[PDB]
Design an enzyme around this catalytic site. Structure first.
Site, PDB file in Angstrom:
ATOM      1  N   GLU A  98      25.222  -2.715 -54.738  1.00 27.89           N
ATOM      2  CA  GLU A  98      23.945  -2.904 -54.647  1.00 27.89           C
ATOM      3  C   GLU A  98      23.595  -2.908 -52.842  1.00 27.89           C
ATOM      4  OE1 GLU A  98      21.674  -3.032 -56.379  1.00 27.89           O
ATOM      5  OE2 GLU A  98      22.893  -3.610 -58.488  1.00 27.89           O
ATOM      6  N   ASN A 119      30.927   8.264 -73.928  1.00 31.03           N
ATOM      7  CA  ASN A 119      29.326   8.015 -74.722  1.00 31.03           C
ATOM      8  C   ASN A 119      28.588   7.069 -73.521  1.00 31.03           C
ATOM      9  OD1 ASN A 119      27.820   5.600 -76.051  1.00 31.03           O
ATOM     10  ND2 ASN A 119      27.874   7.450 -77.332  1.00 31.03           N
ATOM     11  N   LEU A 130      15.868  -7.948 -57.748  1.00 26.46           N
ATOM     12  CA  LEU A 130      14.652  -7.304 -58.050  1.00 26.46           C
ATOM     13  C   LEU A 130      13.402  -8.445 -57.722  1.00 26.46           C
ATOM     14  CD1 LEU A 130      12.521  -5.215 -59.250  1.00 26.46           C
ATOM     15  CD2 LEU A 130      13.088  -6.126 -61.525  1.00 26.46           C
ATOM     16  N   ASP A 184      13.948  -0.328 -54.469  1.00 22.81           N
ATOM     17  CA  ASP A 184      15.270   0.093 -55.051  1.00 22.81           C
ATOM     18  C   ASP A 184      15.298   1.615 -55.614  1.00 22.81           C
ATOM     19  OD1 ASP A 184      13.941  -0.021 -57.290  1.00 22.81           O
ATOM     20  OD2 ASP A 184      14.948  -1.386 -58.439  1.00 22.81           O
ATOM     21  N   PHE A 187      23.534  -7.022 -64.874  1.00 21.01           N
ATOM     22  CA  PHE A 187      22.931  -7.295 -63.434  1.00 21.01           C
ATOM     23  C   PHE A 187      21.960  -6.242 -62.971  1.00 21.01           C
ATOM     24  CE2 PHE A 187      23.476  -9.904 -59.503  1.00 21.01           C
ATOM     25  CZ  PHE A 187      22.936  -8.810 -58.575  1.00 21.01           C
ATOM     26  N   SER A 212      28.406   2.501 -77.514  1.00 18.28           N
ATOM     27  CA  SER A 212      29.290   2.370 -76.354  1.00 18.28           C
ATOM     28  C   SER A 212      29.925   1.086 -76.710  1.00 18.28           C
ATOM     29  CB  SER A 212      28.667   2.217 -75.116  1.00 18.28           C
ATOM     30  OG  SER A 212      28.248   3.736 -74.693  1.00 18.28           O
TER      31      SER A 212
END
Ligand SMILES: [Cl-]
Ligand SMILES: [Cl-]
Length: 164
Positions: A11, A132, A32, A20, A104, A117
């Site tokens: 990040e 996948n 965010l 972002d 996250f 998955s």
């Protein structure tokens, strides 16, 4: 390596409000603020989050505080999610950090949607899971980051983050 250093690499760290990858107002270590197009709305959420009049800027300490909150919330969210909990409980420490990273980034709901998955990870079918996971908008929109997380799930080592 640890989850914090991992997210720091994925990040980055920005002390001023920024947009972002999806164009949303964010701050600090990928925190965010709002999906709303308005800077004032962003500014309002920020002050509310920090507890002071920020004027759209925070300190390093404040950014790390939001990250501790966020990681903690990601973890509690996973433990309380019927779909995510069992997967997380079945994994090793390294891979658990990769699941936290996805939570996250995209939210518990988003991750809980990778049904197939999840099933493969729980079965410990590493290569199949990695294939996948890559058939997703997530991988096509943020490929470098997704590849690092995917490799982490694949190998169970921090190799994709070493050198970073
Ligand atoms: Cl908050
Ligand atoms: Cl990327």
């Amino acid at each position: 390596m640890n989850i914090f250093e991992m997210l720091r690499i994925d990040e980055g760290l920005r002390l001023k409000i920024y947009k972002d990858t999806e164009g949303y107002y964010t701050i600090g270590i990928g925190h965010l603020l709002t999906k709303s197009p308005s800077l004032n709305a962003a500014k309002s959420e920020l002050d509310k989050a920090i507890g002071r009049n920020t004027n759209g800027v925070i300190t390093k300490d404040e950014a790390e505080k939001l990250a501790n909150q966020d990681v903690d919330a990601a973890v509690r969210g996973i433990l309380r999610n019927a779909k995510l909990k069992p997967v997380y409980d079945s994994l090793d420490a390294v891979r658990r950090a990769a699941l936290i990273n996805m939570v996250f980034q995209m939210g518990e709901t988003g991750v809980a949607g990778f049904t197939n998955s999840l099933r493969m990870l729980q079965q410990k079918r590493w290569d199949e899971a990695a294939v996948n996971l890559a058939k997703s908008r997530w991988y096509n929109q943020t490929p470098n980051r997704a590849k690092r997380v995917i490799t982490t799930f694949r190998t169970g080592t921090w190799d994709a983050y070493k050198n970073l």
